[PDB]
């Protein structure tokens, strides 16, 4: 088993009508636990998970102070990055920041990620060593040289390797029956008739946690397959399906394979 914490901080510059929009979205494994929005009536760190309400008022005030502090930090960073690329003030730009740590079944630290983005493209990222930075362009090298003297790489390393792991293990304890749970997928194969003398077979997988699943179609063993992205049901479970164009009569010749951590053995499915 493996569990990971992820914080998604986004800053969207609004030209003329803002006051840029700042959103913080937190995730533990595949479930949302914290939320922050500058456009909200009362800008404060809100719980999205019911088990997160157990945390005291001192924690929420501390996370709001961090979020409000980051809001003005990204606001200054938006104007700084505007000067780095020498772009017009009339245009709208976005800064994305995702960070967190991944722990094993021990459960101790495996990898720490801390990456930045400007207008949906890579800007600066902290390497796997958690001591060096990788700059995408010449404007990002200015940020790297500024963070080398300031010692940002060593500062973030102190969090990702220690403070991140410490809190991730705490959130797993708070949501013991919500995060550590594993629901097996409800699988069934559906038949769809065609007009070109061929039928479409769909291998369904509904109601499962976590989202990590791999659906494959086998004949005697892949490229001809039509797999869709894992979609959330809304109630707390996920959905995913694979489709193949197969000839009429050979409905039982094609077998589907489901790979999920909730299942003790990989399932074999056929149309009936």
């Amino acid at each position: 088993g493996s569990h990971s914490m992820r914080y998604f901080e986004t800053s969207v510059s609004r030209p003329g009508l803002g006051e840029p929009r700042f959103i913080i979205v937190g995730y533990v494994d595949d479930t949302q636990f914290v939320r922050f929005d500058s456009d909200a009536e009362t800008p404060r760190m809100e719980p999205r998970a019911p088990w997160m309400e157990q945390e005291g008022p001192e924690y929420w005030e501390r996370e709001t102070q961090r979020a409000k502090g980051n809001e003005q930090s990204f606001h200054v960073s938006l104007r700084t990055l505007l000067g780095y690329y020498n772009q017009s003030e009339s245009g709208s730009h976005t800064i994305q920041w995702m960070y967190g740590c991944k722990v094993g079944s021990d459960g101790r630290f495996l990898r720490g990620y801390l990456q930045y983005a400007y207008d949906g493209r890579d800007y600066i990222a902290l390497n796997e060593d958690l001591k060096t930075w990788t700059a995408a362009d010449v404007a990002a090298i200015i940020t790297r040289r500024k963070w080398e003297q300031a010692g940002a790489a060593e500062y973030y390393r102190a969090y990702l390797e220690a403070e991140c792991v410490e809190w991730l293990l705490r959130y797993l304890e708070l949501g013991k029956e919500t995060l550590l749970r594993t629901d097996p997928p409800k699988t069934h194969v559906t038949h769809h008739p065609g007009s070109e003398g061929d039928v479409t077979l769909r291998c369904w997988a509904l109601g499962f946690y976590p989202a990590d699943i791999t659906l494959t179609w086998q004949l005697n063993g892949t490229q001809d397959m039509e797999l869709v992205e894992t979609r959330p049901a809304g109630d707390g479970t996920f959905q995913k399906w694979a489709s193949v164009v197969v000839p009429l009569g050979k409905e039982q010749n094609y077998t589907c394979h489901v790979y999920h951590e909730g299942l003790p053995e990989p399932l074999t499915l056929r149309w009936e």
Partner: peptide
């Protein structure tokens, strides 16, 4: 918890 952002 998260972490404080360093100015770009």
């Amino acid at each position: 918890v998260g972490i404080t952002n360093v100015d770009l």
